[PDB]
């Protein structure tokens, strides 16, 4: 399109070497993810054109479509620190990032011992770093209260969605949030820099590193990241073991309660997290380690309720406003079913 030109100009003007002197009739762009927001494209030199210096042959273009300062600063910082794709270009419409040869993980891979251990280690790393953002943990209850406010105001026109929403509203979401509030306020959890969306779709498996045991993954997509309770980040990740967003028919996901990590799988994950986060931890006694882990299991199982609640509310608002083809109302109902299931399991 016209879009094609613009993208050519971005690459020509922002990228070094071969790119600088490149013609419009040599530009290779393809869609990776279309839509109206956060569109993703692959852009590349002709296979035929040689590279002057260090310039990449392929880049990823992200377009904002339809807090900008914050996300940009964070992405740049993560690039500088080698915990994210390099930033090659930034502009009002979007950015040019490094193209990492890789694929996203699938849902079932989250439970593989070595994958899970590395995710825990990466999360521990992310959690231990300093970022120029507000350190007060207002994000969790702030976001829930914001989405709850939207939810309570939403009017659907179509009858199907009116009834689905009516069933969700019948839980008494305001009162249930206060129930969650008293539970979580009685559960100490350290405030750390949280990814807040640590799912398979945000975890790259690096090409050529598949044989590495401990270093084959990169966490990406920090758009929800904030200082938050560590319980949320781990609990949210555990919840993600149940949800597979690759299903190709309506509602475009599958939920499987049975796939929530067992006590053993949770212990495996936190056994890998804790030494990467707490430098002393390795040197503690067996009983002290055991005490910490048992406490941490209670912590993250309770914060998993907020994952269900927050993303359930979020998903209701998305049904009203999103352009993505996804069964948002059914996903909201699946999160709320898991919320009540997890409360029954915990006895809270
Ligand atoms: C609707 O189809 C989709 C939706 C999202 C992502 C994808 N495809 C991929 O993620 C593939 C594996 C990773 C590939 N990749 C190489 N470098 C990448 C980069 N820097 N970012 C992302 C990326 C960014 C935000 N969300 C998902 C992936 N992806 C990068 C792109 C192709 C396909
Ligand atoms: Mg994402």
Swiss-Prot record:
Pathways per UniProt: Phospholipid metabolism; phosphatidylcholine biosynthesis; phosphocholine from choline: step 1/1; Phospholipid metabolism; phosphatidylethanolamine biosynthesis; phosphatidylethanolamine from ethanolamine: step 1/3
Record field: catalytic activity: choline + ATP = phosphocholine + ADP + H(+); ethanolamine + ATP = phosphoethanolamine + ADP + H(+)
Record-listed N6-acetyllysine modification sites: 138
Consequence of substituting residue 138 to Q: Mimics acetylation; promoting monomerization, leading to decreased choline kinase activity. Increased lipolysis of lipid droplets
Function as written in the Swiss-Prot or TrEMBL entry: Plays a key role in phospholipid biosynthesis by catalyzing the phosphorylation of free choline to phosphocholine, the first step in phosphatidylcholine biosynthesis. Also phosphorylates ethanolamine, thereby contributing to phosphatidylethanolamine biosynthesis. Has higher activity with choline. May contribute to tumor cell growth.
E.C. number: 2.7.1.32, 2.7.1.82
Record text on activity regulation: Homodimerization or heterodimerization is required for the choline and ethanolamine kinase activities.
Family: Belongs to the choline/ethanolamine kinase family.
GO BP: any one term: lipid metabolic process
Binding residues for ATP: 33-39, 62, 98-104, 199, 221
Principal EC category: transferase
Modified positions (Phosphoserine) in chain numbering: 170
Name of the featured protein: Choline kinase alpha
Associated disorder: Neurodevelopmental disorder with microcephaly, movement abnormalities, and seizures: An autosomal recessive neurodevelopmental disorder characterized by severe global developmental delay, impaired intellectual development, microcephaly, early-onset seizures, and movement abnormalities.
Main location: cytoplasm
GO cellular component: cytoplasm; cytosol; lipid droplet
Impact when changing residue 57 to W: In NEDMIMS; a functional model in yeast shows reduced choline kinase activity
GO molecular function: ATP binding; choline kinase activity; cholinesterase activity; ethanolamine kinase activity; protein homodimerization activity; protein tyrosine kinase activity
Binding site for phosphocholine: 35-37
Subunit structure as annotated in this protein's UniProt entry: Homodimer. Heterodimer with CHKB. (Microbial infection) Interacts with PI4KA/PI4KIIIalpha; CHKA bridges PI4KA/PI4KIIIalpha and hepatitis C virus (HCV) non-structural protein 5A (NS5A) and potentiates NS5A-stimulated PI4KA activity, which then facilitates the targeting of the ternary complex to the ER for viral replication.
First-to-last residue of the parent protein present: 85 to 457 of 457
Keyword entries, A-Z: Acetylation, ATP-binding, Cytoplasm, Disease variant, Epilepsy, Intellectual disability, Kinase, Lipid biosynthesis, Lipid droplet, Lipid metabolism, Nucleotide-binding, Phospholipid biosynthesis, Phospholipid metabolism, Phosphoprotein, Transferase, Tyrosine-protein kinase
Organism expressing this protein natively: Homo sapiens (Human)
Keyword hit for Ion transport: no
Compartments (UniProt record): Cytoplasm, Cytosol
